[PDB]
Amino acid sequence: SGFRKMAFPSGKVEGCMVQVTCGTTTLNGLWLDDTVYCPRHVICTAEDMLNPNYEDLLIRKSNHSFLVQAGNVQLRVIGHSMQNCLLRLKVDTSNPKTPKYKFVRIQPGQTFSVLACYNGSPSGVYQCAMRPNHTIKGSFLNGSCGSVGFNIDYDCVSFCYMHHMELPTGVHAGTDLEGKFYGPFVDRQTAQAAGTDTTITLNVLAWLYAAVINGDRWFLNRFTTTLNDFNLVAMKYNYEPLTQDHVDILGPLSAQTGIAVLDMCAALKELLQNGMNGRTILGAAALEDEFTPFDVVRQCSGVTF
Amino acid sequence: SGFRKMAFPSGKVEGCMVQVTCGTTTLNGLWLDDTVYCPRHVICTAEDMLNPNYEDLLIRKSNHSFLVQAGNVQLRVIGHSMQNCLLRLKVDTSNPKTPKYKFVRIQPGQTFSVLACYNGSPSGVYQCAMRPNHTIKGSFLNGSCGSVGFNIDYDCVSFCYMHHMELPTGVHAGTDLEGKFYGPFVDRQTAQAAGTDTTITLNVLAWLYAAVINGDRWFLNRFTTTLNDFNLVAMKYNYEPLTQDHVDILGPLSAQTGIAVLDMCAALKELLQNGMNGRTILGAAALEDEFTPFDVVRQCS
């Protein structure tokens, strides 16, 4: 009954992780029904990445140019096309583990789970958040390309992220399951770099409510603040500016605790200008910004799948 | 690159979670082959929990006394027995989703994944460490009892933990899959409290190498140190004393980074003594110790 950055159960997703190899290039594929999705750069190699003409490289590819391995069974690819940055492979077998699912494009600040895979093999799962600067500070080794990000609603897996690349700063860039990159990032080797990041203020506030819910509330005060004054302070400390929308998304939580959002902003304000003073909140020495308002209700309602 | 506190994929464990009910008590259970494992206290209510006698309690129960369900479907229990603080119930169906598994008793400082369950349904997964005082700093609402901690090596699930209860300080206590409690606790409403919790020195050094490997190394310095001198400081700060066994274990990571273990101890002596100075390591504002050296080498190569 503490509080823990929890990942969704990865069971339904593990069942869709396969291996996709093109010559010497091996990475991960997403097998949903008779389609396998993966990053199109699987048809690349060293030289290729520097200004690749994906269309012309793909033309030189036959269906036999790909080997697809689900466990120890080989999947026969019978069709292939490109959809934006993804390769779509058509296999002769509809994945018997296909879960109820859907594809979504998430928004900056929003969190999800990542099942890290290699050679088609799920190696681990963690939570992370789409950074305001459109990157995930993840943990990926070579051949992790293809690992996916997802959330879960009741029955339905919502796929929202596929991994393509690591930026110079060690941060990470990828696409939604439609092949569109998040951010201005391209799957070429160019001099693209992550712009400056900021703290997801919405998620800090949700976390602060979390603490209060769990009876951890020493930081609350008697005053309130305006949305302006709050944004004048936050942007000094590199926080995303807070919007009336953000305020409304915090609705349920502020209702649950009976603490208004601008009243909670006052608390953040003093936590920023004055720091934490060797105190903790939910056992943390620093403020957390990778819990969304919905994560908090989720974990605090013992929601189940 | 990057460094997250990853759990193992929970898929294999999901397929053995079930709901076990007795009277008006319901908790989770583990379904491997034709046997269901759950905490023996599923047979307690109100009175019982304050100083019970699980021996007299069980004799008064039949197979019929246990409602077991994989999802909406009831499983016929054709047998029951007590094993230490566990209850074992034989069922008439084998579990097809039963994976390659084994029961292991881990040691404080080691890490595992927990699959938090309610009514036999998964809520989430997370990685943690078995504390030196034998508790785990978990996230377990009411009814999570019977959820399991595990590790996965290859195809094979190693179960090491089944959750039994929560202590006054809001931390958690449980048993290996053989029914024996980690640490001196009992499944009774009593005045038991957790011993002194210390930082897991070995894990912290591992995590400092994880920070070096990932480019974060402002905390490094010219000095080195002796084992004795490091322990004299580290103990001042409620840190586990460090041993040669511990240093040896750290070999591979020192050989990876260049940095000698003892040099890293000297860096760690500075951190303990000076605080972090408003800076972070791998984004963290406090030293992190739920990573084993085996954990770090694996995630970092």
Question: Can you give the C-alpha Rg of chain A in angstroms?
Answer: 22
Mark which of A47, A81, A99 sits at the end of a domain.
A99
Q: Do B11 and A6 touch (CB under 8 A)?
A: no
Mark which of A197, A216, A240 sits at the end of a domain.
A197
| CA nearest to B163, candidates B4, B291, B13 | B13
- Other C-beta atoms closer than 10 Å to the C-beta of A159 total 23
How is residue B37 annotated by DSSP?
E
**CA–CA gap between residue B13 and residue A226 (Å, rounded):** 49
Q: Does A204 touch chain B (CB under 8 A)?
A: no
How are beta strands A77-83 and A86-91 bridged, if at all? antiparallel
Residue type, position A68, single letter: V
| CA nearest to B109, candidates B241, B260, B3 | B241
Q: For chains A and B, what is the number of CB pairs under 8 angstroms? A: 125
Same domain flag for A246 and A175: no
Pair A253, A206: CB distance under 8 Å: yes
Same domain flag for B205 and B299: yes
**CA–CA gap between residue B216 and residue B285 (Å, rounded):** 13
Same domain flag for A10 and A121: yes
> Solving technique for this entry?
X-ray
**CA–CA gap between residue A101 and residue A91 (Å, rounded):** 19
**CATH number of the structural domain spanning residue A21:** 2.40.10.10
Domain hosting B138: range is: 1-14+100-197
Same domain flag for A67 and A109: no
Q: Which helix (H) or strand (E) holds A274?
A: helix A261-274
Question: Can you give the C-alpha Rg of chain B in angstroms?
Answer: 22
Same domain flag for A78 and A183: no
Same domain flag for B187 and B71: no
Contacts with A, B 21-60, CB within 8 Å? none
Q: Does B71 touch chain A (CB under 8 A)?
A: no
Q: Of B4, B138, B284, which has the smallest distance from its Cβ to A126's Cβ? A: B4
Same domain flag for A223 and A182: no
Which structure tokens are listed for A297? 């209700």
Contacts with A, B 133-172, CB within 8 Å? 137-144, 166, 170-171
Same domain flag for A183 and A211: no
Residue type, position A196, single letter: T
Same domain flag for A204 and A69: no
| Sign of the Cα pseudo-torsion (B128, B133, B139, B140, in order) | positive
**CATH number of the structural domain spanning residue B206:** 1.10.1840.10
Pair B87, B42: CB distance under 8 Å: yes
> How many structural domains compose chain B?
3
Task: For residue A93, give Cα distances in angstroms to A34, A66, A75, B124.
Answer: 6, 15, 7, 31
Task: For residue B220, give Cα distances in angstroms to A101, B11, B216, B223, B257.
Answer: 47, 40, 9, 9, 12
Q: Does B128 touch chain A (CB under 8 A)?
A: yes
Same domain flag for B241 and B229: yes
Q: Do A299 and B139 touch (CB under 8 A)?
A: yes
Same domain flag for B120 and B4: yes
Which structure tokens are listed for B227? 């084992």
Same domain flag for A135 and A2: yes
Strand positions, DSSP E, chain B: 17-22, 25-32, 35-39, 67-70, 73-75, 77-83, 86-91, 100-103, 111-118, 121-129, 148-153, 156-166, 172-175
- Sequence-distant (6+) residues with CB within 8 A of B195 are B133, B134, B183, B184
Q: Do A6 and B116 touch (CB under 8 A)?
A: yes
